[PDB]
Design a protein around this ligand. Structure first.
Ligand code: NI
Length: 341
């Protein structure tokens, strides 16, 4: 049954609730972003209004084949009425087209649902600064102080220099980047740009990127593998056996593969800096794990919540165990007491 934390009280709205069949009493299904846990259930046979960003719209239409009539794209940063209720969609700084949703209830309550987000100080000068938020539905993916990670800008700097060096030393080396969803495009785009290449990928993936309203994207990607020295592959395929294989397929055009696995957090965040990262090397194949996160670190989460000063917080991630629940409530209380709300 659809859990409480996917329902918005005093409306007939749900959020990211597509895998329970018809939800008794739902008049509009919001989708925060095109990631499969969130969209799970949607298809061409869904016949209820879906509200979402223009980009998430393009992906539902073209990837899932949802019928145009059921997709209601909304512009960001714009006061909009939906079944008699003022709502605003805000950039979640997660993957392309990912939004947070402000709900202005008839009773005067104001609710923010973050979807998936990476909290940033720029959000403190959005439409959120203009009024008080009573309830916060929160992406708690990394709600624990061991979860530190570098800025996106730092991680991209690393990957750019690493790849530029490897390729300037050996012009017959190939860069390969893993992917399994939208998000983290900047990894392979910033690498391609420094190397004077377009990025080459399968037809499935090119289609996915063609929906994303990226400017000058035709200048940056291609389906022609051969013409391109940055390749995207399934993240499953980013291993020694799978890179070896793929290295054969280029037909002796390249002698070395340098590959990147953009992980979230992994325990080596606790000990190692970005400057001091090293790969796994099996001959002429190296694999860098890079901690490129599109979720709030603990400190970023904490700041955003202490700025927002919500009256109540409802977690949407790590809710399946009592230990996780209980641990999160402790940090919420700590934050509230330290900041005096
Ligand atoms: Ni996500």
């Amino acid at each position: 049954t659809c859990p409480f934390y996917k329902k918005i009280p005093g409306t007939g709205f749900t959020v990211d609730a597509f895998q329970y069949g018809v939800v008794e009493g739902c008049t509009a299904y919001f989708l925060t972003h095109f990631h499969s846990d969130h969209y799970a259930g949607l298809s061409k046979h869904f016949t209820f209004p879906v509200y979402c960003s223009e980009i998430t719209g393009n992906l539902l239409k073209n990837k899932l084949h949802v019928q145009e009539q059921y997709i209601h794209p909304l512009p960001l940063d714009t006061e909009c009425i939906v079944n008699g209720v003022k709502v605003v969609l805000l950039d979640a700084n997660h993957c392309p087209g990912a939004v947070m949703i402000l709900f202005y209830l008839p009773n005067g309550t104001v609710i923010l649902h973050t979807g998936d987000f990476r909290a940033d100080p720029s959000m403190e000068r959005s439409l959120l600064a203009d009024q008080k938020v009573h309830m916060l539905y929160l992406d708690t993916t990394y709600c624990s102080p061991e979860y530190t990670f570098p800025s996106q800008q730092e991680v991209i700097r690393f990957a750019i220099n690493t790849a530029f060096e490897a390729v300037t030393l050996n012009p017959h080396a190939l860069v390969v980047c893993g992917t399994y969803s939208i998000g983290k495009e900047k990894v392979f785009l910033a690498i391609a740009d420094v190397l004077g290449s377009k990025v080459g990928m399968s037809q499935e993936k090119y289609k996915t990127l063609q929906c994303l309203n990226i400017p000058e994207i035709n200048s940056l990607i291609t389906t022609d593998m051969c013409s391109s020295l940055v390749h995207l592959l399934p993240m499953m395929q980013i291993n020694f056996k799978g890179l070896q294989s793929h290295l054969k397929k280029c037909g002796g055009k390249y002698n070395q593969i340098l590959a990147f696995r953009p992980t979230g957090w992994t325990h080596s965040n606790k000990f190692t800096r970005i400057a001091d990262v090293i790969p796994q090397t099996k001959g002429n194949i190296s694999i860098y794990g890079i901690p490129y996160s599109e979720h709030s670190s603990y400190l970023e989460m904490k700041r955003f919540v202490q700025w927002l000063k919500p009256q109540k917080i409802i977690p949407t991630v790590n809710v399946g165990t009592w230990k996780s629940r209980s641990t999160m409530e402790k940090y919420f209380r700590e934050w509230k007491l330290e900041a005096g709300y």
